[PDB]
Design a protein around this nucleic acid. Structure first.
Lengths: 132, 51, 201, 179, 100, 188
RNA sequence: GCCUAACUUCUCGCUCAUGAGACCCCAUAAAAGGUGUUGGUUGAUAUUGACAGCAAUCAACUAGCCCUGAAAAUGGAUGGCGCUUAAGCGAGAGACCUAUACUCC
RNA sequence: GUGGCAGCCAAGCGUCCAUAGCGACGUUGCUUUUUGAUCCUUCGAUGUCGGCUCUUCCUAUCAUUGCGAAGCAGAAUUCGCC
């Protein structure tokens, strides 16, 4: 029933707190609530975080218990975890929201016009399909 | 009645333990009463055997 | 922060007191609130606790004249209404005007049978530990005197059948809409470029 | 009464001695490791313990030094054993407890919180006799030992997520299972 | 102080308030449960209390002291001329009760 | 303490299948299928292999961990019920009055008469999927048979508790129908 | 949490009570008990394979919460509603609210 | 305090057997239907005993409903529970 697990080498996504929005790798498990993570190549320092702020990704690295920052960096770069993560809809939505949050007034106007024109055309096509 | 049937009926009617606080009919090999009213008393007595 | 329309809330899988306090705050802040399926609201703790609490509530009646004493409503809607009343200054004009803006129903009346309902995740029953019992206000009302549990069940079954048919139709229309966008791709490519560049898709 | 106020108690090394007199021109120097919120509390607790152990009080003594101690390597996980003595509502008891932490100060803070949680014991009724790092094979508590596994794995079964900066009401469906 | 000697209360408190009936005609507060299998039939009628008299009948009550004996019993006559059916109405269930 | 992980497995013999999902089990064998709902416990039940069903609990407390072997025992009883069924043999004990036992309503109701000489008739309906039989060979023997142990034993206990002595000490007024044996239908 | 201005804010535990508990004076509870659960102390046995049945276990203690001990007369009181990974119990952290008090005008 | 009611340990009674039912020497409580103690309210007045009548309430349950235990083989009787 559960696929992703909290295991050494599991790549986690920081959902809230200090380094929000970044990726790290679980290098140790302290107790049922706390994990030692270290995202050397994603600008996350080796720290201990409460699992309540973390979310499990689909990537698991080939790490060792308490792998040092150098080894974590090597595994991260070898697996290309950042590139593979950037291909998921998880990361695409974050990128889209990042673009959206910084829209200027002119960009908002342009989006309004383009969106309504596209909706009108798609509605014409939908009427065609519905009639048939 | 046949002695085997005697035993069968006594297993259900007589071979049991009685709590000394709530008179609960309890299993023979029990350590505490199961009733909350006595606070699960640990002191029990055998159901009074045919003397 | 006022809402233009009334806030329609589906009461299913909601904790009684939590939802009641949220709704009371909204009513005090000036919104109109409608609660649907009040028979699906949940109370934490085993059924016996709630049943005995309601029995002790029923025991509170004026000795001189019960027609003045506490009025013990059995319908789930009125139970929720009284729970919200408890969290308002209902003896003052402010509290009375706030309470008059609340409508709680069992089932979904025809007026709201075609509107989307809201939920309060901070009042959901899934914030309880999984190994904890809970009671359903519908069952409590039935056991304390409510007489229309079967009627509401039948009406809800019919409503769910009609909704299932409507949802099948809606899925078909949604697939047609996806196909229409795919067909329009060549014409909308000029606008899709801007939409994706600004990050909306 | 003394309280373990503050996230992550600090650790201090306090060195003091009885003020020399004519009959005792040179006096022994005592050193203690104290866990407190700040150095004022550290000094007060040092005098408390030193007066309990030797015939000297703050009036006749002086503090040669007081220095905060910082964890050497906070980037490694260790098992800490804590020997403590505490007062219950009825009698006096000795306890041995174990924690897993990156800092000894963090482990002692965990000990104080745990004692408060499980025994309703306040900081004024707890004495930390000793704190050390124990090896994995030398631990003797199931809760700690269960994490001495290189293949440890587990999911997060029933995740209730709190919406932070958005309206109370939503039409979204809430999901507690994440596979 | 408790009453010295016990005695039941006078009257039935479930028949209060002892007020004049709201209407002159009797209101049927409940009808017999409907069984779909039986033939269609009416469940009530209207009559007038004409008066009382007494009759003699033979009692068939095995085991009774008046078995196969004649007894005198008081009876009431209710004149019930035929009624006329003038309309049809139906009731639909709602969350608040049946509704015409 | 919340133990991180605790599980137990059930291995199915040949000719039996389970197809578990959503904490609902659908065991099926030669004598039909039994469906059981275990949604009152929050454990993960899955198929590990081809004939092994694992029931696992993550971060459970003593009371929750106590239910893993309970669920496993229930599934084992399901297997036994679908393979060899359940048969409870009960014996009538009486001092003077023969306890007359009969079946009515299409063999769906057990009627007990003359218990201790009472003229009342005791009626016990049988649950669906449970049958009763008065042994012609062994006198004073009733047999309750079925796939589901819960329902078979519930019917047997209903019959046993139906014949209870009142206002007379039970230490020697031992009349009644008592479950003498709990066995299987197919000779194991 | 709502009455009620100020978080259903953050961290770790404990507790299920067939009306649990909930904050100085303060608005009662004891001797004595529980194989409910959670921690500890001591003494033993156990891989020269510990107890049960034809891989840890046993025993005695101890103290947190819960339970029994716990009966009164108009209907009734953690202030009320309600609250159960709490809105309870204990240790803590940020912020925030509020006097005719403090600073300034 | 006194009155009333309920517990804890078991020396004994109970043919034998401390606990079926009791329970001494001790000891812990609860109640305000006794009587005391006090003097807080009322002396520009709260009509001061009992009975009669009539409501309602509490149980610390005599009877009745459903049960458990006996030194329960049954009219009968005793103990306890909801």
């Amino acid at each position: 029933v559960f696929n992703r697990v909290v295991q050494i080498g599991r790549v986690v996504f920081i959902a809230s707190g200090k380094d929000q929005g970044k990726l790290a790798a679980i290098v140790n498990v302290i107790d049922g609530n706390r994990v030692q993570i270290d995202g050397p190549s994603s600008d996350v320092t080796r720290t201990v975080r409460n699992l309540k702020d973390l979310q499990l990704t689909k990537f698991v690295l080939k790490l060792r218990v308490g792998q040092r920052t150098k080894g974590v960096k090597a595994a991260f770069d070898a697996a290309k975890v950042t590139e593979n993560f950037q291909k998921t809809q998880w990361a695409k939505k974050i990128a889209q929201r990042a673009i959206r949050a910084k829209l200027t007034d002119f960009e908002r106007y342009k989006l309004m016009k383009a969106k309504q024109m596209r909706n009108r055309i798609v509605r014409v096509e939908l009427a065609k399909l519905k009639k048939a | 009645i046949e002695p085997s049937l005697r035993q069968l009926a006594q297993k259900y009617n007589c071979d049991k333990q009685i709590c000394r606080k709530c008179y609960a009919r309890l299993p023979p090999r029990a350590s505490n009463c199961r009733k909350k009213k006595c606070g699960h008393s640990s002191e029990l007595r055998i159901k009074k055997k045919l003397k | 922060g006022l809402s233009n329309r009334a806030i329609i809330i589906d009461g299913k899988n909601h904790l009684l007191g939590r939802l009641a306090s949220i709704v009371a705050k909204k009513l005090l802040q000036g919104d109109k609130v409608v609660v649907l399926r009040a028979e699906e609201i949940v109370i934490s703790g085993n059924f016996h606790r709630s049943k005995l609490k309601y029995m002790s509530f029923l025991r509170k009646r004026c000795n001189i004249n019960p027609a003045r004493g506490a009025f013990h409503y059995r319908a789930p809607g009125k139970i929720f209404w009284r729970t919200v009343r408890g969290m308002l200054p209902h003896k003052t004009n402010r509290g009375n005007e706030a309470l008059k803006n609340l409508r709680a129903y069992e089932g979904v009346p025809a007026k709201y049978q075609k509107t989307k309902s809201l939920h309060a995740p901070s009042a959901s029953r899934f914030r309880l530990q999984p190994r904890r019992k809970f009671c359903v206000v519908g069952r409590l009302s039935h056991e304390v005197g409510w007489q229309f549990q079967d009627v509401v069940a039948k009406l809800e079954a019919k409503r769910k059948v009609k909704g299932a048919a409507y949802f099948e139709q809606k899925k078909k229309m949604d697939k047609l809409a996806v196909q229409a966008k795919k067909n329009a791709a060549p014409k909308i490519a000029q606008y899709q470029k801007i939409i994706e560049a600004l990050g909306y898709n | 009464p003394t309280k373990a106020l503050g996230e992550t108690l600090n650790e201090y090394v306090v060195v003091g001695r009885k003020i020399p007199t004519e009959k005792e021109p040179v006096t022994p120097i005592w050193k203690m490791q104290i866990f407190a919120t700040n150095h004022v509390i550290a000094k007060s607790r040092f005098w408390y313990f030193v007066s309990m152990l030797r015939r000297v009080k703050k009036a006749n003594g002086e503090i040669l030094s007081i220095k905060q101690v910082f964890e050497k390597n906070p980037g490694t996980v260790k098992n800490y054993g804590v020997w403590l003595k505490y007062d219950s509502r009825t009698g006096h008891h000795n306890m041995y407890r174990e924690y897993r932490d990156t800092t000894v100060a963090g482990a002692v803070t965990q000990c104080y919180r745990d004692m408060g949680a499980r025994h309703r014991a306040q900081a004024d009724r707890i004495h930390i006799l000793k704190v050390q790092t124990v090896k994995a094979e030398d631990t003797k508590r199931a809760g700690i030992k269960m994490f001495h596994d290189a293949k440890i794995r587990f999911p997060l079964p029933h995740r209730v997520t709190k919406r932070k900066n958005l309206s109370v009401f939503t039409t979204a469906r809430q999901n507690t299972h994440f596979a | 102080s408790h009453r010295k000697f016990s005695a039941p209360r006078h009257g039935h408190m479930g028949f209060t308030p002892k007020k004049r009936s709201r209407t002159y005609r009797g209101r049927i507060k409940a009808f017999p449960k409907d069984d779909k299998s039986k033939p269609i039939h009416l469940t009530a009628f209207l009559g007038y209390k004409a008066g009382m008299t007494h009759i003699v009948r033979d009692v068939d009550k095995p085991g009774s002291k008046v078995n196969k004996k004649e007894v005198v019993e008081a009876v009431t006559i209710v004149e019930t001329p035929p009624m006329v059916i003038a309309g049809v109405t139906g009731y639909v269930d709602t969350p608040q009760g049946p509704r015409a | 303490m919340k133990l991180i992980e605790s599980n137990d497995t059930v291995v199915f013999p040949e000719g039996v299948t389970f197809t578990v999902k959503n904490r609902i089990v659908h065991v099926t064998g030669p004598r039909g299928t039994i469906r059981k709902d275990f949604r009152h416990l929050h454990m993960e039940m899955e198929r590990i292999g081809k004939s092994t069903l694992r029931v696992r609990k993550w971060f459970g407390v003593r009371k929750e961990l106590a239910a893993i072997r309970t669920v496993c025992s229930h599934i084992k009883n399901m297997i036994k019920g679908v393979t060899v069924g359940f048969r409870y043999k009960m014996r009538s004990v009486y001092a003077h009055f023969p306890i007359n036992v009969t079946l009515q309503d299409g063999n769906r109701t057990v009627e007990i008469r003359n218990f201790l000489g009472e003229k009342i008739v005791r009626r016990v309906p049988l649950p669906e999927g449970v049958i009763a039989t008065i042994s012609t060979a062994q006198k004073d023997e009733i047999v309750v048979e079925g796939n589901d142990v819960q329902f078979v034993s519930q019917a047997a206990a209903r019959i046993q508790q139906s014949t209870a002595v009142k206002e007379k000490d039970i230490r020697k007024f031992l009349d009644g129908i008592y479950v003498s044996e709990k066995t299987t239908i197919v000779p194991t």
